[PDB]
């Protein structure tokens, strides 16, 4: 409670672009270093420290003015945030309830990927928030979720890789929440995802194709799976990706492609494409990646699809 009063006033001084803030940075970092020693063990004074951070609204201004804090101080901000977030009084989680009432915290962390100086630090904290279903729900259903499709395509590899890390977590952690979300925003969310499968970046094209395959095969995403494999232009894309210059990309495509073929309730436009390329796909899959010898599953999977295509007939 003593340290809170000093840090609150000094951060407001640092908020000003004045050169006099150079001395305040020493006081801000020392305040954060003292708070880290309390939380990270003694837990008597910890109980009062939490309520002081909530009521002051300091937990909001610390992320807001994270770029103005020094490296050593920035490390402490992360340690404090991640510790406070895991605090549990009974069944209730007080920080999750706080960030539920203060959602700007989540969007400030997400907008963090735009600034390289704090992008990775923000990524870690944003990922810690989305561990809890209510905080993941807020980002998922927000319009700011669509920014990930631009954040994963960034020029800096490390930030872009961290962006996909959070993006993947948001779509795979809370499977009941994700399934309902994807069902609601299907048309807009998959219009954006198509751009990732069309990416010039090999890693973006591979990891997106892999995640798509992972999403569709999950039991919770049955409605999404049925909707994806019903669209004719989606099969055409998977069939085109099987012909990509990269054998890793064409292998990742095969796992999305196999879902289209193995389904008993295939839509007529899909049946027409598969019948129009019936002997073409028979000879393709017969010679497709024969080098993969130590993979009995892939060998059996190919023969199943060859039979499924050969067994195809008109309605």
């Amino acid at each position: 409670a003593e340290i809170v009063k000093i840090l609150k006033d000094n951060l407001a001084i640092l908020e000003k672009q004045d050169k006099k803030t150079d001395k305040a940075s020493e006081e801000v970092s020392k305040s954060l270093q003292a708070m880290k020693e309390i939380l990270c063990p003694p837990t008597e004074a910890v109980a009062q420290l939490a309520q002081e951070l909530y009521s002051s609204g300091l937990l909001v201004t610390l992320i807001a003015d994270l770029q103005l804090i020094d490296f050593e101080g920035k490390k402490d901000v992360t340690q404090i945030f991640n510790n406070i977030l895991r605090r549990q009084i009974g069944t209730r989680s007080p920080t999750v309830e706080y960030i539920s009432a203060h959602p700007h915290i989540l969007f400030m962390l997400l907008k963090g990927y735009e600034a390289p100086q704090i992008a990775l630090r923000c990524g870690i904290m944003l990922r810690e928030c989305i561990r809890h279903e209510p905080l993941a729900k807020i980002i998922l259903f927000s319009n700011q979720f669509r920014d990930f499709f631009k954040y994963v395509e960034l020029s800096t590899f490390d930030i872009a890789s961290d962006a996909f890390a959070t993006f993947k977590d948001l779509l795979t952690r809370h499977k009941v929440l994700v399934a309902d979300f994807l069902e609601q925003n299907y048309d807009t969310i998959f219009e954006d995802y198509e751009k990732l499968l069309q990416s010039e970046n090999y890693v973006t094209k591979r990891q997106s194709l892999k995640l798509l395959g992972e999403l569709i095969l999950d039991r919770h995403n049955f409605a999404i799976m049925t909707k994806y494999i019903s669209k004719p232009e989606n099969l055409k894309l998977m069939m085109n990706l099987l012909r990509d210059k990269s054998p890793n990309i064409q292998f990742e495509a095969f796992h999305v492609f196999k879902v289209f073929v193995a389904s008993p309730h295939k839509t007529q436009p899909i049946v027409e494409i598969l019948l129009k390329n019936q002997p073409k796909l028979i000879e393709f899959l017969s010679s497709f990646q024969k080098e993969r010898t130590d993979d009995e599953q892939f060998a059996d999977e190919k023969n199943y699809l060859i039979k499924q295509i050969r067994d195809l007939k008109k309605t």
């Binding site: 490390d158 970046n201 090999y202």
Partner: protein, 264 residues
Amino acid sequence: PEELFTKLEKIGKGSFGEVFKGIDNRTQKVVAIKIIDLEEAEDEIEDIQQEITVLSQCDSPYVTKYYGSYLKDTKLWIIMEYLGGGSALDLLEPGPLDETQIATILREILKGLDYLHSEKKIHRDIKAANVLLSEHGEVKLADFGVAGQLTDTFVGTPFWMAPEVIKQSAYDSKADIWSLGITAIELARGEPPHSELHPMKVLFLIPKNNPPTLEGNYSKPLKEFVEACLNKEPSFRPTAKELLKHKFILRNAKKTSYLTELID
């Protein structure tokens, strides 16, 4: 992508790609270029990206510095600290090491472990092959482990692995202390314990059989250092800070500039 750096000599042909001695065309500083072909290295991208995350969080002169990554088509360029003094494993190749050299190397590993463990990080792959030297004599830790025993494997080198890691029980910083004890025997005898056996047989032996002991013409403080580290119970093993104050380290370890004598 290739315009910012110039590859000089090929300092090593890696598992997935190739490592080169390089120079930054911007800052003129000498760096190590790790070019990885993401093809043939099917999956493993997530593992490289996880190592990049850990390395970017590390800021210590006892852990290899990371400068950044660049992607060109299917090849990933990793820019790291240049250390042309080889590894501790390479120092064992021309002949046997004396107890002064063993204590000097172990002290530097402990200084590196002290930073990682205080930063709530586990190296997970402490061995002479991962203990690198600068050129001036500086000793830094490189090539961290992963997470999940099924993901480890049969592929795997369990000679340095802690018994609780194989037992698939909860492991912390103390697992690296076991690995340090095996590395101490590796620096003294030349090779780690049960080296004459197949890795699969060693994997089952470690949690079953008694902890290894250093045998032969080796002093009592060195034997006691190994005994302290190689404890089947991780909670009974001393911390990195505790082993820095060991009777063997304080008496036999000298200046790191003396390690310059071994450069082959």
